[PDB]
Amino acid sequence: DIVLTQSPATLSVTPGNSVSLSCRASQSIGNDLHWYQQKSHESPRLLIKYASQSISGIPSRFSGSGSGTDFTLSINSVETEDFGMYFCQQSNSWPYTFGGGTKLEIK
């Protein structure tokens, strides 16, 4: 099955600064890569779909980029409400798979 590897595993940042999170697929998945945010005691929240498509109700500071095997989730000027876990998920082939996640923490 498709394996998604996320890096770094953890990223510390000070509110106001920007960050970019990486997700790489073991094989090409076109643009079928989505990004989720998950906080303790809460269900995942879809942030970006199909690599770079925006989602209504999500802060504009979130953007996605990439195609094939290398993808990135960027947060322009991190806010405290952004601290938590970020997971990428591919839907190009069944079974759908998730990356191991990147933890974003305050520095």
Next chain:
Amino acid sequence: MSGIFRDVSLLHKPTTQISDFHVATRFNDDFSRAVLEAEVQMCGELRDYLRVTVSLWQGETQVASGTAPFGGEIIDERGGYADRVTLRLNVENPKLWSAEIPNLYRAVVELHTADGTLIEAEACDVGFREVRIENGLLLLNGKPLLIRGVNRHEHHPLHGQVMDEQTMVQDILLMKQNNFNAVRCSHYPNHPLWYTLCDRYGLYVVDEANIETHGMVPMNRLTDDPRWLPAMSERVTRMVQRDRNHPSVIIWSLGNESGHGANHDALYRWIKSVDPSRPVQYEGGGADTTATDIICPMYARVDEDQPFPAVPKWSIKKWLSLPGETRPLILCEYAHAMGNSLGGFAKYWQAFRQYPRLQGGFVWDWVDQSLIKYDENGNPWSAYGGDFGDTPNDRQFCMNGLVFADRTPH
């Protein structure tokens, strides 16, 4: 159905901008060399410091670039277009696009000033391919195609006629997996992304105008009427202006089942004039009218004739050798896949394989146009014609796909 079923957007453009652009590729006898030709037009004030650069990339690698300022060649007694420019880039040993190998390039069109400042940029994917009918055969890059295709509607059991990337992609992959080369946009221009995916995954596309007047009597009634000429005209012209740069599109179609009227003849000529890179097809009025470059019937049998008055359907093998006939024949719809069907499919495949001028066809059709309904316990079930108290209706007639609405195969 009805509503705002495709996207809504906002686009912010500069005041002085790129208003349109087209791409074209010519080749030499053996395709070892090509010319990419880009015609650009702009809107706004024309200032001598304005320039255009068209660059061709292959990956990270720039392959060719050209720069120039506005102002075309003399066209007639009054001059040329001052707001247009055409560049021509030479490309040696271009990688060719085909459904077998979708070689693509990226073309960037920059509108800048001479001091290097960028006003704005546009782009598109480019595929080097030549489409021609020659000597009764339809050729792609010099060889003759054999279209393994299917007709596909924009249908989602849940979303009705709203399309999404996931669905498009699913469809594409199923098709490719199942030995399809091509798809027909039955029977209107599709959601934009579609072409792009085809361009990229590799499928030949027949782009079709949104014109079907099947229910008139006779069929011709509006299409033969000059008063509908304008309305029709816009359905064809805009399609072309919009999709003309996609490599996957290899044939233009005037619509569907609207008989054969003088309006078609005009529109067919229009296209030929505007974009001679592709052939035009239209089945209405007998499948072999003066408005089609290809004999493209629907449901013609292999060996048996169905000689309806006015618009018979000869056996395909026979149709080709009718006196004076020389065009290639590709079925716009054949092998009606409604329910427990597809008997005889092989007969077709065999003719296709034995007769050169029989270059395949489009099966009818891809997905079942069934919709989801819910029962007394929030249990879903597949609904069809008349199941929404809809009147009048055609019941199961909306289910002729090769795959179920959920994309599971029949």
Next chain:
Amino acid sequence: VDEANIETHGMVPMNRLTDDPRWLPAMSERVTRMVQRDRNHPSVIIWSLGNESGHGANHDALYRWIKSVDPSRPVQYEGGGADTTATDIICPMYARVDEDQPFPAVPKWSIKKWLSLPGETRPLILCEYAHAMGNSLGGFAKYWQAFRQYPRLQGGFVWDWVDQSLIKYDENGNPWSAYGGDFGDTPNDRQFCMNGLVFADRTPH
């Protein structure tokens, strides 16, 4: 269909003489005299350059000659593939209805298919079809049906009318039908001379 007395079937390749300018004259006389002699008959509707002599430049010339001299009739010649530049009609021998026989150089496409080959527009009439040798004629109907469904398939010539058997006499002055090699003839093709629809006496098969 009036046909020139020219058949060089036994050469290798078939063309050998017909492509040779030195035979041009000889051939020429076989065509020209035929025309000068039979040209006024109404029954003659097509001229033929001969039979099974491959396809040579000599045919092309002779075909043009005729066209010039008597444009009232079409010319046909099957040699060299049945659809050469020396024939106004596609006129193969033994082409099947539905199956192709793609010999190198000179294939025999299925008749229905032959017509729609790219660029082709001539009518097709078989110079020989349905070899009537002995217990034969199976499938005859298939032909009739294509002929009837395809306009450009305007029929053909069955091969052939009478058995080329000869009369011999026995130990008691009793006659009997003889064939190839029965006259101590060498070399010979035996029964191959009997493909008629009627026996030599004109009694039907």
